[PDB]
Write an enzyme that holds these catalytic residues in place. Structure first.
Site, PDB file in Angstrom:
ATOM      1  N   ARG A 238       0.828  -1.209   0.000  1.00 28.14           N
ATOM      2  CA  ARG A 238       0.000   0.000   0.000  1.00 28.14           C
ATOM      3  C   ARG A 238       0.867   1.266   0.000  1.00 28.14           C
ATOM      4  NH1 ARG A 238      -5.425  -0.824   1.428  1.00 28.14           N
ATOM      5  NH2 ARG A 238      -5.127   0.772   3.079  1.00 28.14           N
TER       6      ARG A 238
ATOM      7  N   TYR B 120      -6.722   5.382  18.247  1.00 28.71           N
ATOM      8  CA  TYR B 120      -6.111   5.741  16.957  1.00 28.71           C
ATOM      9  C   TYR B 120      -6.010   7.277  16.825  1.00 28.71           C
ATOM     10  CZ  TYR B 120      -5.628   6.629  12.003  1.00 28.71           C
ATOM     11  OH  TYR B 120      -5.225   7.142  10.793  1.00 28.71           O
TER      12      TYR B 120
ATOM     13  N   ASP C 250      -2.991  12.279   9.508  1.00 32.45           N
ATOM     14  CA  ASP C 250      -4.356  11.926   9.070  1.00 32.45           C
ATOM     15  C   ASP C 250      -5.121  13.235   8.919  1.00 32.45           C
ATOM     16  OD1 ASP C 250      -7.175  11.185   8.964  1.00 32.45           O
ATOM     17  OD2 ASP C 250      -6.628   9.254   9.975  1.00 32.45           O
TER      18      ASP C 250
END
Ligand SMILES: NC(=O)c1ccc[n+]([C@@H]2O[C@H](COP(=O)([O-])OP(=O)(O)OC[C@H]3O[C@@H](n4cnc5c(N)ncnc54)[C@H](OP(=O)(O)O)[C@@H]3O)[C@@H](O)[C@H]2O)c1
Ligand SMILES: NC(=O)c1ccc[n+]([C@@H]2O[C@H](COP(=O)([O-])OP(=O)(O)OC[C@H]3O[C@@H](n4cnc5c(N)ncnc54)[C@H](OP(=O)(O)O)[C@@H]3O)[C@@H](O)[C@H]2O)c1
Ligand SMILES: NC(=O)c1ccc[n+]([C@@H]2O[C@H](COP(=O)([O-])OP(=O)(O)OC[C@H]3O[C@@H](n4cnc5c(N)ncnc54)[C@H](OP(=O)(O)O)[C@@H]3O)[C@@H](O)[C@H]2O)c1
Ligand SMILES: NC(=O)c1ccc[n+]([C@@H]2O[C@H](COP(=O)([O-])OP(=O)(O)OC[C@H]3O[C@@H](n4cnc5c(N)ncnc54)[C@H](OP(=O)(O)O)[C@@H]3O)[C@@H](O)[C@H]2O)c1
Ligand SMILES: CC1(C)N=C(N)N=C(N)N1c1ccc(Cl)c(Cl)c1
Ligand SMILES: CC1(C)N=C(N)N=C(N)N1c1ccc(Cl)c(Cl)c1
Ligand SMILES: CC1(C)N=C(N)N=C(N)N1c1ccc(Cl)c(Cl)c1
Ligand SMILES: CC1(C)N=C(N)N=C(N)N1c1ccc(Cl)c(Cl)c1
Lengths: 249, 248, 248, 249
Positions: free
Chosen positions: D13, D155, D142
């Site tokens: 990935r 997370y 993120d």
């Protein structure tokens, strides 16, 4: 019939001022402490003298470990054992010391700085929620998290994770009627260790009054966030920093 | 008794703000543009509680060559009526779409004038006219970084008002004047908005699936002007029920 | 055919560096200028000597007024007239001077909010209306949240430009136009600043205790218009050598 | 004379695309992996066929534990042993799964989510800096950190801590000439298991193209940050999210 609150690291300084002002507002309080047993017992004594059976102490180390979940469950359980309810959690306890990137073990530093500032709040949050009409959690954050002190990586990481927790928990616990908010001091009570000249250097940077916040000034924002006047506020972090975060290099 | 100016005070959030300051003991100037009847009705309600503690002041807050004089007049009205001006709440706001794809310059004058330039000029006038507890509170928007589609100029205006909040907090802190903001999410929905459309918004809110009462916005304002906020400046308190935390 | 770009304020300094680097990358450029006619024509001559018919100039005052929409339309139309297309807009021009809260104030508003925010908005409207790798890059300010004291209106303008960046990215994404920003910290210091004051600023920069070169700022622009940024929209890249991380 | 890079979680990935594009740019690479040995070795073999002795693999679990510091020292040391230098560190490896606040042990969840996303990056960053020209670290963050997925608190905490690290390490390492930046994807490669109907739900939210980013698009931002074109950039996080973080509820 009086609501009840847990305040972590409440024996001295800002957490003491929070516990006192919650008690003044009507709350029964659990005074969590780690090392400061004499101060904790003396504060509980002072509060109980004002209204009997309204304050208990609870000792725990909030360093991360495989027993931290049980310690955090025990803190919340101490509130239910003493008062039959737990309406407010204030996550105030915090370790702070430098962790330079370039030349206790580092795993101990991680457990202490990330445990106290981030993982213990998360586990205290889990326990608070699981054990559950104005419920709320207030995390003590840091107004200077984006302009950090040099060589304080792990502390800074823990405080950023605590912002993450404040937002994530606000979203997840809103359907249970639990609000989660933060208060972010800039310079408030300076470290006992710090010399006078360094204290004065910090004080002179603060736009509003050239002075540190009193502990009571921080507590006032916590009181607002737990009050009926904040019933639509969740996920918000209130800076209480006299403008310090707005000052460029 | 201290005295406050609230702009756009005749209706909705500004009215709730003026009511609550008055209830806290302030004398109030109720600024209005088109809503004279409503403004006077509120002043009548307040003065019936305590005589001579509320006055009205008309001004268009569209930007133009006369806006500085109008803003100076709003502040002066408070000093004339009450002898002092302790609090400014910049509440008045225009809100409508301005698609990128009224002339566009009238839209500029209204959206950037009410939401940003009038606050700036009122702030300059308030500061220039100065145990006291002086503060300004700007009504911001919790959705400033996740904007409504086709609302560029409105969003620009609200971002400018965050900049004013921060810049003014820094520059006026030596004068003892604190400057802060309250950022509503879904509060009182626009009269126009259809019923199904309102309910769509209410369902996205984490806290309770409904909009903030104006009174919930006013409560944050009351905190920021209080002695319980004396160290707070340059802060914006979201009052949005969690809505800004909700991903697409 | 080669793509074409408009750079505002491109006669000197960072805007020249952007225009030169876009030209070196293969773009045809419109060099917008206001007062710097000699500099603009000199740069365009330099670029046309490197490759014939690849640079034109376009004069315009970007102060806000009722004719600013037409001026912004004209700048975009100058690119289509010269080159048949307009792929990239770089909003670089900016006024900057103090506006203490304690020229007329409305002139200051028209110049600082006009050049930093309203003219970017109208140019964005004109660029989009006249429409492949299309993008807009706005020159923002890395220190927006830690502003210089007494620069309210400039800070308000640059905050509004962050709003525009985000609102335009959202609205123009369905047309395939990306909108991004580049936020310098200290780059080319003002010509009128004395060396002692320039060194005060340099010494604050963690990464090398020096200001950014104009070319360093242009490199980030070049990345955001390139095929390596094809999924990036609504982003503001700080280029500040860490200055924004430095506490008081 | 070719520079060298470590990329963590590089077998598949996004990390795989990063390692490939760094190699294409002229870097020798350490392909770190945890469980995916066949994929890691297959990538190293492909890269070495392109140019001999330019890729090696390094296995390590990046869950936090007593041994994590030595593991992270060993990953950095692997690059110096293979290539005599370590110019670039990309902290890509990450665990991701829900940790609901209300009903693996929770401390295992802490060690995996906070260790991979935050503590391992910190320890790698320490080891990278201690062992030391265009030196830089790139952390995969993120873009949705402030509008998090429901029940992803640990997370989210880990990714907020990584923003703190990125900022704190940029400040502390800038005197050594080491730049520290992040790249923050929105929706990029979707989880393997996910049904198309659910993947489509995510794709339809993205303003720019109604599609997820390819791994190569994320890698292009990393390549920019490590390049001579980013030599004044430190402490910056570039969102690569097609406008997704700008979309309201
Ligand atoms: N003071 C400031 O200017 C300032 C600035 C920014 C942020 N804050 C934040 O505001 C909060 C209050 O600050 P403060 O200065 O009052 O804090 P502090 O005096 O440094 O610490 C608060 C208490 O934390 C407890 N604590 C420390 N390590 C612990 C561990 N391993 N386990 C359990 N408890 C532990 C200690 O309890 P015992 O004494 O009982 O061991 C300590 O008294 C903190 O979260 C701080 O990060 C403060
Ligand atoms: N309602 C919400 O959910 C919400 C959400 C986000 C932010 N806000 C912010 O919160 C504040 C109050 O919101 P609201 O819904 O109560 O506002 P609103 O009803 O839209 O307007 C407040 C008042 O502003 C005045 N105003 C409009 N254009 C004007 C002009 N050109 N000159 C002078 N005054 C003018 C009008 O007064 P007259 O009636 O006298 O003409 C109007 O009644 C605003 O700043 C708004 O941006 C509200
Ligand atoms: N330099 C830095 O350190 C720094 C720091 C933060 C942000 N920035 C931003 O980066 C950009 C480039 O900065 P810079 O220092 O190169 O800028 P600058 O030299 O101060 O100004 C760039 C150009 O703006 C044009 N301009 C000024 N007023 C104008 C008007 N009324 N109408 C039309 N054009 C007008 C001028 O063109 P003429 O000369 O043709 O009149 C000027 O050459 C600006 O957006 C700036 O705010 C720069
Ligand atoms: N894909 C997206 O849409 C997206 C969105 C937002 C942010 N990001 C961030 O972008 C980065 C790359 O994303 P991705 O989707 O390619 O990641 P991914 O496939 O979920 O994970 C990357 C690799 O992390 C390694 N990893 C997981 N747990 C580990 C542990 N305990 N010890 C060591 N390594 C471990 C695994 O290696 P092995 O296979 O060898 O076990 C896995 O192949 C991550 O940091 C992610 O959080 C991605
Ligand atoms: C008091 C101290 C150590 N306590 C904790 N736990 N967290 C902080 N941020 N603290 C801090 C640190 C530095 C300064 Cl200058 C000031 Cl005013 C306060
Ligand atoms: C109330 C309204 C129109 N008035 C102003 N001045 N500013 C806004 N942001 N407003 C708004 C706009 C949209 C919604 Cl959904 C909601 Cl709840 C409120
Ligand atoms: C160069 C200057 C004036 N030009 C514009 N238009 N905008 C800025 N922000 N500029 C600035 C202002 C102050 C400093 Cl200290 C530095 Cl380095 C640069
Ligand atoms: C791929 C996955 C799981 N891997 C990690 N390590 N971190 C993420 N953020 N990931 C994620 C999670 C959810 C979505 Cl919708 C998307 Cl696109 C990606």
């Amino acid at each position: 019939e009086a609501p009840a609150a847990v305040v972590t690291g409440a024996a001295k300084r800002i957490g003491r001022a929070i516990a006192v002002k919650l008690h003044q507002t009507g709350y029964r309080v659990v005074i969590h402490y780690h090392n400061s047993a004499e101060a904790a017992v003396s504060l509980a004594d002072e509060l109980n003298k004002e209204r009997s059976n309204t304050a208990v102490v609870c000792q725990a180390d909030l360093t991360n470990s495989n027993v931290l979940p049980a310690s955090c469950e025990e803190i919340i359980n101490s509130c239910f054992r003493a008062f039959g309810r737990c309406d407010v959690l204030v996550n105030n306890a915090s370790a702070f010391y430098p962790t330079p990137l370039v030349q206790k073990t580092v795993e101990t530093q991680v457990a202490e700085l990330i445990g106290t500032n981030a993982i213990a709040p998360f586990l205290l949050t889990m326990s608070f929620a699981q054990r559950q009409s104005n419920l709320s959690i207030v995390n003590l954050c840091d107004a200077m998290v984006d302009q950090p002190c040099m060589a304080f990586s792990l502390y800074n990481m823990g405080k950023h994770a605590l912002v993450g927790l404040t937002q994530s928990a606000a979203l997840e616990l809103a359907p249970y009627g639990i609000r989660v908010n933060g208060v972010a001091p800039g310079v408030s009570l300076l470290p006992v260790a710090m010399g006078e000249e360094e204290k004065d250097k910090w004080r002179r940077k603060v736009p509003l009054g050239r002075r540190e916040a009193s502990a009571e000034q921080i507590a006032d924002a916590v009181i607002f966030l737990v009050s009926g006047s904040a019933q639509y506020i969740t996920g918000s972090i209130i800076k209480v920093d006299g403008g310090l975060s707005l000052v460029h290099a």
